[PDB]
């Protein structure tokens, strides 16, 4: 399989600040990577697919990029509604795999 | 006392033209040009047409989802294709050698759809792909006789398969290649980009690659599918190999009849009538050598000509009692064309010269039959399809047809005029010949009156008149009373 | 769009078969591939597999021997059957729709899930 | 005393053939084959031809610098293309589907040159290339309606452009691909080597790559330009994409008229005369059904036949006190058939006007049947074929030769059969007067055996002008015998 | 005493048809349709055919080892190709534009084989390749006029060569490309895989790459050789360049004659006879305007028609002593068609009216010659080859030929019937004209008997009757004895 490793396990980035999350693949995934936002009490939401393509229904504050093995998710200015656990998904192999989840929390 | 030689006249208003004269009224005439059809599309030789309705040939054979009524088609006598049909390549694309295929399907009639490469044999591939452009009841779909092979899991293993034609007859096989709008589509659907599709038989060696390009959207799709076809000879084998972009056939078509037919362009439907000659405007029921209904006729038909009328005289000039052929008009004689009017002590009346009339009659009958019977009637389909890149060839074909049409029209027109001139001269000659046949026998026993009648010097009774009329008059017995 | 709701027992025995259904609302299966995803407490997500309306399926190679995904006849439901539960299977189970390639193309692989459902927590215990 | 029945003779030397006889002299005849043209190339239906001079069609449409006089061309009725023209593809190359294009231009007449992809839109590219092959006054140049896109600075960005046909009518678009002699040339001009050119519309999907190879030099260059064309349907869009070797059109051509025309091969010029039918040898002004001037004729023309003469007799055999038995009434100039009387008041000739007019009308109708039944239509006739289409060219030739033999054979026999009948017709008509008259005169006359009747009864001018009218009052003359 | 006017009759069963009457039996007739050939394949215009035996054109030109008998072919008048020959492409393959080549070879006759690229010029390459498919006496071999260039040692240097056409005439050059069954084969034979073959002239610009694919085996091989050809114009240069898979020509063919000819399909052989017109069934030796032997005829030939008989009447109706033309039957008169029978005090007998007969004779001769001499005879070959992807064109060609055949057959049938009707009407008219020519001179000195004879009132001897036959009867001297 392809192991998807996220880092840091948590961010302490405060409201209004830029939040950057990383994901590293054990094998190249080309551009075949997606990001999801998971919160307690609700279904995970797709934010990004295809490494950098934004999903619909998602505000412009979310963006991301990368290729091969090195990818990031960026929130240009973190809002209170963005405190969530985020994860990356690999879909350049079979089975599809997900990262462990990075929690964004306030300092 | 008196015997006259003359000819038949009646109330006829039929007119013919001749080389020397125009609008000549004749006692009898034969129209040799068929002008009227029945307004219906009929079963040909008792077999119904293939009615495609709004489908094209490509839509039919590929299985456009809107052509479901054509998935199983009984033997047809001809194909009725609507001009500018709606249901064709729903997923936009093109079809190679399409005109040659339409031509091939002419001499086909029934064919059997045979499963060659079952959809579920394609393990390790996704065979569930489809498109909104071909949607049925909202849900996306695809050509029903084709399999769109796309990536499964994360791979597109080389797709292979083959078929040995053990079906009993030469088979038609259709396949195609997907041409994506962009690289993203190519990778999402097939994983690899540097792909190819390779197909072959003992005679076919064809390999192609997809052309990824931005194209105008058709039916919402910027992509295109290219379809092509071959005939797999009996006992040969067709191989397919692909690394992506292959649309495989699921079915092939075994030709079952290989008879003679054609494709008609028409907006009508089948009216459940029967014919031997069908034009797009209706069926023609005739025994005449020429017709002027429509040039694109399928069947065993009369020659099409540009003429409006072709009428042969068969009779005499219709030229309306005590005079002969010099004045004409014996409307009181209805026994035959040529004859006598006698007057004597017992009575008077008209009679036909049956020998003369029957010979003239047989002559005219043979003449009319020569004109008709010498015309060669063969089954033909006439129409041909050409692409927009074959205009010189299309025009050559048109010119050939126009050329033959002018030749046959010109010949039909002059044959009728020349024969009508001879017909009327023939009849004038025949009545004159009775006049002299009789004059030479009566000799000096009669007075010529100058109006086509002979006056007897001797008394001539009804037995005498009978003798004169059948040519047995005894000249010596009557050399008296002068 | 559609909403997905997971349903079934929240309690499974340590030697058991786990069975969950997913009901669609505001739509139907409609040529799309539908998936099951698992999340053990304290862990990231694990993909289980999917199914097409037609019955075509794809399973995570590690769970093939224990997993059946099926549709049935309602055309707006699908379900997961997980056998030989060892309680290492305690997890939140989620159903999701694989994102379509585009409005025009469907029935093809994508690998990202756009409509997800709240999920149901199943505890395996005795 | 005597009345004779006879016929017209004159000093005519016209001769006809018949099915049974040859070189028969007749009193009157009509030639139905047109043999003379005027030696000039005329305006057709008042509209001048397009005179290409030394230019080929490809040179004209691409803008060969030596074809500047053709940059703006007024409406034409036909095209005069010199056979083996000089000014064509100056930069050596080839033109695909050229014969189909020449065919297309037949049913076109006027068209408008429209700028579609202005040269200055090609930013980030060099649009100033050229070659000594197309040079003007020494200075290297290029086809004027084309843009040769080459490297600028150190780059060749993907070249793109498109055009939506909103011009009002179907448009002709020509473009091409450069094929280098070698790799050095490819890199010098385009930077990349692995290049392609892609062009398409809703129906066109064409993609090709340059073929780099050493080639024999033509016009000094070892390179070649390949040109191709399509028609962009109204409201469609043509897209161009290239990574190198694209020669983009600057202009397209909007078809303006779509009338009936054709391409004539000729070395002549326009003489500003007018016609309805034009052959390469000169114009034909005629009303006759056949001609033998040239088979490649453009216009509404008589049928071309291989015959030398087609002459219909209209008259009598011209065969200079006797009737029709001897013939020769050169003294009768009143009509074809008639009478000669001699009595004690005078003598002289008169025509039988009833007989002559009927025969006359008959002959007129016969001639008109032959001419009026012939179908005259506009044709371009000539077709172009490539050197790989020999079987098709041969099929086309066979078709034309086949129809020509059919029409020539029929024209020859129709004339011979009709002339035999014409002369028999006239002989019949004069004999019919002999008997029409014999039958009213009956026993009051003696036949003399030479086509004349001698009256027993004295017959004066009023009597003669009774017999001649078909009113001889027979019972009043039964005396003097 | 008596002079009769009448006509010739004889012992004859010749029959003609007319427009009015069928099976009239005539005293003389001319058959204008040629029905018999000699059963042999003859030298045409003194020059033998090219007998290929079991070879195809491709086998011949490539040098199939079984076509050794054709390596030095002398000038030919036509080519005899067996239909479905065996000695074709021994190494399985295809030949591009083959139909165009066969057409080209029609107007060729002799050509010279010229060595252009000698096998031993290919240094640094292996020129000793071959295959069991083309084996001779077991030993693997190859097409003899071709060089298969393969790896030498461990390398395949780019293969190059060229030829400048200084041969004196336009030359035919054939070359081809090998297409391996797989990549193992490609490397074993050429070392590189990413290969191409490039060929060109001032007009030819062709580049092609090998298509490596699994194919059904033909003659034991899954590989294919694709051949193509061009004509190298005089003084031009053909260049060849290859990185693998090139089969180079060793020889080219210089066209020597360029005259008119054609390709005949036949299983026969040369019989050492000579003709001017040859069909596949035998040669035709005739002067008639039409024939019905076979439509695919090479030479200067009569028109082919579908008719069975075209016979012109030249003579009189053959209708078998003291009567004239009214009864006919003068079998005792063999002097001419029309004439007199007289009986007087000195003697009796038949004589021809030489003036009348000769004029009628000349008329009939001119009529027959008009029908025959106006027919246009040209050299033709008729047959054409089409590929299996050219069915619309093949059918257009067929249709054109069938169209012209129906036109000529119809015209031939009616021309004969119309002319036979006129011939017999002509003779009847001419005989009657003597009757009246004579009647009008004899006037009142004779009794008309009503059976085509005149009786003299005045005694008329054998000098008087001659005066009558001359048209000089001195009427005023015989006005007596009545
Ligand atoms: C393609 O199939 C033909 C036919 O195979 C036979 O008939 C089928 C209906 C089925 O019953 C098969 O099992 C039969 O073998 C193959 O042609 C035969 O080949 C064998 C072996 O050389 C020969 O003995 C037979 O006479 C051939 N029969 C005929 C009709 O030609 C053919 O070889 C197969 N092609 C391929 C590539 O496998
Ligand atoms: C190509 O252009 C046509 C025409 O566009 C219209 O007419 C032009 C002259 C200009 O005034 C434009 O702004 C006009 O829109 C396009 O066809 C039209 O498409 C619209 C929908 O967007 C439709 O409502 C119109 O009826 C269409 N008009 C016609 C005549 O069919 C066409 O879509 C353009 N193609 C591309 C690829 O851009
Ligand atoms: C291909 O050959 C022609 C002919 O060359 C001449 O004739 C040969 C038989 C031989 O005797 C040669 O040495 C001769 O030179 C070449 O055409 C000639 O080219 C020269 C220019 O160098 C010109 O002056 C001559 O008039 C040309 N002769 C003819 C008949 O055209 C031609 O150039 C050669 N092509 C190539 C690519 O080398
Ligand atoms: C003509 O005569 C026929 C039969 O004699 C008769 O049936 C018909 O009504 C007549 N018609 C005219 C127009 O006189
Ligand atoms: C013959 O009659 C038709 C009407 O039926 C008329 O139009 C035509 O002009 C007439 N022709 C002649 C020569 O009178
Ligand atoms: C043609 O008409 C005749 C009557 O004249 C009829 O008996 C025959 O059935 C008709 N033919 C067809 C195919 O309907
Ligand atoms: C012909 O007419 C005569 C006279 O009436 C008669 O006797 C005879 O029987 C008729 N037919 C013949 C020739 O037998
Ligand atoms: C015949 O005479 C006329 C004068 O009446 C003259 O004009 C004409 O040229 C002459 N024709 C011939 C052939 O002599
Ligand atoms: C008819 O006249 C032409 C021209 O003088 C001559 O060549 C031809 O031989 C003549 N034919 C006959 C049969 O006299
Ligand atoms: C054609 O000939 C006619 C006389 O028949 C004449 O009036 C007309 O002007 C001529 N036209 C031309 C273009 O010469
Ligand atoms: C006809 O008679 C002639 C003699 O005049 C003779 O030579 C010929 O053989 C005979 N033909 C037949 C068929 O009897
Ligand atoms: C003419 O004769 C042939 C041969 O005997 C015969 O087959 C044909 O039927 C005859 N024609 C007629 C109308 O009897
Ligand atoms: C053709 O027939 C003629 C007789 O008309 C004969 O002399 C000649 O030898 C024949 N030629 C051949 C090749 O049979």
Numbering used by the authors:
A (entry chain L): 1 to 107
B (entry chain C), D (entry chain A), E (entry chain B): 11 to 54, 54a, 55 to 82, 82a, 83 to 92, 92a, 93 to 125, 125a, ...
C (entry chain H): 1 to 82, 82A, 82B, 82C, 83 to 100, 100A, 100B, 100C, ...
Lines from the paper:
Influenza A viruses are categorized by their surface glycoproteins including hemagglutinin (HA), which binds sialic acid receptors on the surface of a host cell and mediates fusion of the virus with the host endosomal membrane. While only the H1N1 and H3N2 influenza A subtypes currently circulate in humans, the H2N2 influenza virus poses a distinct risk. A recent phase 1 clinical trial investigating a ferritin nanoparticle vaccine displaying H2 hemagglutinin (HA) in H2-naive and H2-exposed adults enabled us to perform comprehensive structural and biochemical characterization of immune memory on the breadth and diversity of the polyclonal serum antibody response elicited. The molecular details of cross-reactive and strain-specific monoclonal antibodies (mAbs) isolated from H2-F-vaccinated individuals were revealed by high-resolution cryoelectron microscopy (cryo-EM).
